Amino acid sequence: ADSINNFLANEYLRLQSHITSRALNILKQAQAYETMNQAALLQKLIDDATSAIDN
Amino acid sequence: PGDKPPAIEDSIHGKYAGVLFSSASSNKSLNKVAEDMKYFNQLYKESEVFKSFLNNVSLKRNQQRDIISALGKTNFNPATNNLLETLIENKRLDSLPKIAEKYMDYYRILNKQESITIISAQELTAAEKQKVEQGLKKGNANVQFTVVYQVDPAILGGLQMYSGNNFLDCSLLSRVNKLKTEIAKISF
């Protein structure tokens, strides 16, 4: 009886960590993609400036 | 001018030329020796026998002394005569040409006149050249100079001035490179 109770308790804790970790990783991964999107937009701007010099 | 040559060097020809410059500038004269050394340089390249004589090393000291006298015992400043005697005694006669050249260099450094070279891609119109002279004048404004032009660069619309030992770049090519580099480092 005690083993199953301890098993369920510790297993519940492990599942909570798994859910929060997934919820945290999704948001962090999204933020990384957003920074890359913003950087790409600005990089495009700089390339237009360089092309203007060349022209 | 303080009996001090422009530069001090430990090379053989440098050592002798500096002593000659100091000694000559000491008593009274530098321009007289300049003509003497200039005459030797022209002769070293124009007269074949004279060049072979100087380079000849199997020659005895007395023989070298007699041939030099036959060249001329006057029209050479006493310093020049004493210099030749010393060279003969020290077997340094072969290096006499270099010394000459080196000396004139120092003399030409004392010359205030200088030649300025401008490099531009586009051909310089005469009207534009006059403006350039006005700018160089206003820059110096205290020394007369002779201008030289040269147009075969990769730069465009840019001017680069060489003045003896100084270089000033106003080329647009530099501006192009600087901007492309700084735009890269924006670190947005």
PDB file of N, CA, C and O in Angstrom, chain A residues 39 42-43 46 49-50 53, chain B residues 176 179-180 183-184 186 188:
ATOM      1  N   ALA A  39      15.311  39.629 -36.515  1.00  0.00           N
ATOM      2  CA  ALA A  39      16.667  39.805 -37.021  1.00  0.00           C
ATOM      3  C   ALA A  39      16.713  39.691 -38.537  1.00  0.00           C
ATOM      4  O   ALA A  39      17.416  40.458 -39.205  1.00  0.00           O
ATOM      5  N   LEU A  42      15.459  42.953 -40.148  1.00  0.00           N
ATOM      6  CA  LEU A  42      16.457  44.016 -40.107  1.00  0.00           C
ATOM      7  C   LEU A  42      17.624  43.718 -41.036  1.00  0.00           C
ATOM      8  O   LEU A  42      18.152  44.625 -41.688  1.00  0.00           O
ATOM      9  N   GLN A  43      18.025  42.450 -41.133  1.00  0.00           N
ATOM     10  CA  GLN A  43      19.107  42.097 -42.044  1.00  0.00           C
ATOM     11  C   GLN A  43      18.725  42.417 -43.482  1.00  0.00           C
ATOM     12  O   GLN A  43      19.564  42.859 -44.275  1.00  0.00           O
ATOM     13  N   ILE A  46      19.302  46.104 -44.019  1.00  0.00           N
ATOM     14  CA  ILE A  46      20.708  46.448 -44.204  1.00  0.00           C
ATOM     15  C   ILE A  46      21.178  46.070 -45.600  1.00  0.00           C
ATOM     16  O   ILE A  46      21.966  46.793 -46.222  1.00  0.00           O
ATOM     17  N   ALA A  49      20.296  48.726 -48.028  1.00  0.00           N
ATOM     18  CA  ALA A  49      21.210  49.858 -47.923  1.00  0.00           C
ATOM     19  C   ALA A  49      22.513  49.587 -48.664  1.00  0.00           C
ATOM     20  O   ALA A  49      23.004  50.441 -49.410  1.00  0.00           O
ATOM     21  N   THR A  50      23.082  48.396 -48.480  1.00  0.00           N
ATOM     22  CA  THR A  50      24.320  48.059 -49.173  1.00  0.00           C
ATOM     23  C   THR A  50      24.114  48.048 -50.679  1.00  0.00           C
ATOM     24  O   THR A  50      24.972  48.512 -51.438  1.00  0.00           O
ATOM     25  N   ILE A  53      24.209  51.567 -52.051  1.00  0.00           N
ATOM     26  CA  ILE A  53      25.580  52.020 -52.262  1.00  0.00           C
ATOM     27  C   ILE A  53      26.112  51.463 -53.572  1.00  0.00           C
ATOM     28  O   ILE A  53      26.646  52.197 -54.411  1.00  0.00           O
TER      29      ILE A  53
ATOM     30  N   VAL B 176      33.366  54.014 -48.984  1.00  0.00           N
ATOM     31  CA  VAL B 176      32.531  52.863 -49.312  1.00  0.00           C
ATOM     32  C   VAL B 176      32.850  51.690 -48.397  1.00  0.00           C
ATOM     33  O   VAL B 176      31.954  51.075 -47.808  1.00  0.00           O
ATOM     34  N   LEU B 179      31.739  52.281 -44.648  1.00  0.00           N
ATOM     35  CA  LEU B 179      30.305  52.148 -44.422  1.00  0.00           C
ATOM     36  C   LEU B 179      29.862  50.692 -44.468  1.00  0.00           C
ATOM     37  O   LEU B 179      29.105  50.239 -43.602  1.00  0.00           O
ATOM     38  N   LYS B 180      30.333  49.934 -45.458  1.00  0.00           N
ATOM     39  CA  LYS B 180      29.915  48.541 -45.555  1.00  0.00           C
ATOM     40  C   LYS B 180      30.374  47.743 -44.347  1.00  0.00           C
ATOM     41  O   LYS B 180      29.711  46.779 -43.950  1.00  0.00           O
ATOM     42  N   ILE B 183      28.135  49.081 -41.164  1.00  0.00           N
ATOM     43  CA  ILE B 183      26.766  48.592 -41.268  1.00  0.00           C
ATOM     44  C   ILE B 183      26.703  47.128 -40.872  1.00  0.00           C
ATOM     45  O   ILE B 183      25.677  46.651 -40.372  1.00  0.00           O
ATOM     46  N   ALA B 184      27.780  46.385 -41.112  1.00  0.00           N
ATOM     47  CA  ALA B 184      27.786  44.973 -40.762  1.00  0.00           C
ATOM     48  C   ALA B 184      27.818  44.785 -39.252  1.00  0.00           C
ATOM     49  O   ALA B 184      27.214  43.844 -38.727  1.00  0.00           O
ATOM     50  N   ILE B 186      26.495  46.535 -36.900  1.00  0.00           N
ATOM     51  CA  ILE B 186      25.438  47.238 -36.175  1.00  0.00           C
ATOM     52  C   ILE B 186      25.029  46.466 -34.930  1.00  0.00           C
ATOM     53  O   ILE B 186      24.735  47.055 -33.883  1.00  0.00           O
ATOM     54  N   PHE B 188      22.340  44.761 -34.365  1.00  0.00           N
ATOM     55  CA  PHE B 188      20.937  44.983 -34.041  1.00  0.00           C
ATOM     56  C   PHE B 188      20.398  43.864 -33.158  1.00  0.00           C
ATOM     57  O   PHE B 188      19.228  43.497 -33.251  1.00  0.00           O
TER      58      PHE B 188
END
